[PDB]
Amino acid sequence: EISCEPGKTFKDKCNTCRCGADGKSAACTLKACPNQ
């Protein structure tokens, strides 16, 4: 599932992800979910 520029990073969820080498995933991180 998922998809994006493989090797790149972005926000995605409310924290911060990192599109994995494949255009279908991204290692992410958690923390408060900024919205404002």
From Swiss-Prot:
Glycans are attached at T9. The record marks L30, K31 as: Reactive bond. It comes from the Eukaryota. Residues 1-36 form the Pacifastin domain. Disulfide bonds join C4-C19, C14-C33, C17-C28. This is Protease inhibitor LCMI-II. It comes from Locusta migratoria. The chain holds residues 57 to 92 of 92 of the full protein.
